[PDB]
Amino acid sequence: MYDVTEWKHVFKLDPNKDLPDEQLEILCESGTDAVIIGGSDGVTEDNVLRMMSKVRRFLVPCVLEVSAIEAIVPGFDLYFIPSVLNSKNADWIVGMHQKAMKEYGELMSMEEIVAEGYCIANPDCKAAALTEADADLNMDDIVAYARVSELLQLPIFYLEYSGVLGDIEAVKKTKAVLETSTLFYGGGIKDAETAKQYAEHADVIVVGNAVYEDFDRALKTVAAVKGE
Amino acid sequence: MYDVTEWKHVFKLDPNKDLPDEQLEILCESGTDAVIIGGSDGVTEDNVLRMMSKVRRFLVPCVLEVSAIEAIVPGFDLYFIPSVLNSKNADWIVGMHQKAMKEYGELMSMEEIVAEGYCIANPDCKAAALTEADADLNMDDIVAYARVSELLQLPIFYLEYSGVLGDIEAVKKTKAVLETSTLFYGGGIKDAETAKQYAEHADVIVVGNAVYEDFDRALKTVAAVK
Ligand SMILES: O=P(O)(O)OC[C@@H](O)CO
Ligand SMILES: [Cl-]
Ligand SMILES: [Cl-]
Ligand SMILES: [Cl-]
Ligand SMILES: [Cl-]
Ligand SMILES: [Cl-]
Ligand SMILES: [Mg+2]
Ligand SMILES: [Mg+2]
Ligand SMILES: [Mg+2]
Ligand SMILES: [Mg+2]
Ligand SMILES: [Mg+2]
Ligand SMILES: [Mg+2]
Ligand SMILES: [Mg+2]
Ligand SMILES: [Mg+2]
Ligand SMILES: [Mg+2]
Ligand SMILES: [Mg+2]
């Protein structure tokens, strides 16, 4: 019953970190279009499970982004499965997914899965280090990866700059080539001003770190793009 | 674009080989559903261009399976860009697609391109060596790759055994999990009986170099399947 082509804003939460329960409830009731749990490496199934149990009561779609096979947990509305298009390690493109289909084939069949084509464009983040991403890219390299995603018809193309604001022109040019894919942008959005700037180009903006740095300011990112 | 979900038989030609007399014409007029220009151990743009010029004049769909950016040549009805799912080198999974998009984005926009999920299941062949494929696979590994191919939205999953016949049970099992893409099988098919056998499970059977070794025998594979 979900359709990411109707979304405009999502919060992405790190189960590796702690957020007060009250704040988690407020984010779920914020008007965001989805709450995504970042199920990565360093990530534990126990933390993903606790998060699932806390957010499942809400109406908002809860999504698990599967970055580590060991941390998959049933019960989420949607499962996003990333392929890091610019990784130099086949494991982050295909490898880990093949291991998951081999070990949890029945589980993967029962879930609603959405493939994401990731382009990590911030060379200094944990994610680029983990995935062996060729993250120091020129704009034309970025646009070519978006075309690759648009060709494989992955539903989502995710331009990832994690803790830094990315070149806004890269976001604009990427959106220019994407016809059927939904463009998710994440990177340094920490307040309403920056949220609105990037939402002018991205289809969906992702707000993550800011939630833990300045909650009230990060909360305003939803009204910034979805409000009057 | 021509609909691969309606195909049953294709011939795949090596542009670095030449069929004699009027055999290429007979093959293109045979009833096969497509003629794919492939290649081995690299290919050359000039050889692909000469092949294009010969097959484009027939109604049968002509397809270029891109195995090198340097050999993309305009003029084909469809372009298949393989992603070698089981390659240990990212360049064979998404590298070809990225370079082609960066270097020839406008050409890619004007042509009809199809991503093809390849699984090289013969560890002892040029293709496995060239693509650094982890090709010594168990049937569950093959099935899992097929599941991935669909995860990645690929319209075609190609199970490749190159110069030998692959395990008929692997074909049967992969067909069983492919809910939304088309299963192409290629590897060692040279005659009607074998073509019919594999066509029982594959959506499309690919007949390759048998056309150079024994054309009359290979030509019978079309009627065998269709
Ligand atoms: O933490 P930030 O910088 O907001 O980025 C959100 C998301 O892109 C992280 O995967
Ligand atoms: Cl764990
Ligand atoms: Cl057709
Ligand atoms: Cl020829
Ligand atoms: Cl004709
Ligand atoms: Cl053969
Ligand atoms: Mg929309
Ligand atoms: Mg546990
Ligand atoms: Mg719920
Ligand atoms: Mg939009
Ligand atoms: Mg059919
Ligand atoms: Mg070959
Ligand atoms: Mg023609
Ligand atoms: Mg024509
Ligand atoms: Mg023409
Ligand atoms: Mg069929």
Curated annotation (Swiss-Prot), chain B:
CDD domains: PcrB_like. Gene3D superfamilies: FMN-linked oxidoreductases. Keywords: Lipid biosynthesis, Lipid metabolism, Magnesium, Metal-binding, Phospholipid biosynthesis, Phospholipid metabolism, Transferase. GO terms for biological process: glycerophospholipid biosynthetic process. Mg(2+) binds at D14, S40. InterPro entries: GGGP/HepGP_synthase_I (IPR039074), GGGP/HepGP_synthase_sf (IPR038597), GGGP_HepGP_synthase (IPR008205). Pathway: Membrane lipid metabolism; glycerophospholipid metabolism. GO terms for molecular function: heptaprenylglyceryl phosphate synthase activity; magnesium ion binding. Its cofactor is Mg(2+). The HepGP product, which is the first archaea-type G1P-based ether lipid being identified within the phylogenetic domain of the bacteria, was found to be subsequently dephosphorylated and acetylated in vivo. However, HepG and its acetylated derivatives represent only a minor fraction of the total lipid in B.subtilis. Belongs to the GGGP/HepGP synthase family. Group I subfamily. Homodimer. This is Heptaprenylglyceryl phosphate synthase. It comes from Bacillus subtilis (strain 168).
